[PDB]
Amino acid sequence: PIIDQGPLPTLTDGDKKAINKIWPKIYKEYEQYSLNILLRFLKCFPQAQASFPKFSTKKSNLEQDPEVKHQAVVIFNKVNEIINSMDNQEEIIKSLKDLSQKHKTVFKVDSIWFKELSSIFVSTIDGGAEFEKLFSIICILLRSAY
Ligand code: HEM
């Protein structure tokens, strides 16, 4: 499963190979996959919608809301960036620690949600242990500033 605290897991060559085998299929339809993931998260955890002021007052037809679609792709693109540089641990650390600080003080998001959205991200793309490890690294780092 996905964890959000403790030492960072290490992605093996095997892990990276599996991730790189599965990702292209998702990436090629990033708009709809990214949207589906966020919508699923909001359906499973309606109480999490309060964490997105840009669409927190929006009810019904979220799929057509520009703020919802944009929020979804911004999250997806960050994951895409990380996958694109799995060989550079330092870059991933630096980048995500900075983002962690922004979510804490600027976006004022409760770090408890990262793991929940990530779980839905993984199940949506039918990812396996390899992706859970990837998202564990991502969540631990996004939770680091808290
Ligand atoms: C895999 C997990 C996640 C990743 C990789 C991620 C990534 C991002 C990125 C890259 C941005 C844009 C940064 C910027 O504009 O400077 C962002 C913004 C934001 N994220 Fe996250 N995020 C994640 C999970 C969450 C969760 C769980 C919530 C809320 C429950 C959340 C709420 C927000 C909000 C409110 C913004 C600000 C949007 C805006 O004002 O334009 N994020 N996130």
UniProtKB/Swiss-Prot annotation:
Subunit text: Monomer.
Highest classification ranks of the organism: Eukaryota, Metazoa, Chordata, Craniata, Vertebrata
Sequence similarity: Belongs to the globin family.
GO MF annotations, alphabetized: heme binding; iron ion binding; oxidoreductase activity; oxygen binding; oxygen carrier activity
Annotated protein name in UniProt: Globin-F1
A Pfam family the protein falls into: Globin
Binding site for heme b: 71, 103
PROSITE patterns membership: GLOBIN
Record keywords: Heme, Iron, Metal-binding, Oxygen transport, Transport
Domain Globin span(s) in chain numbering: 10-146
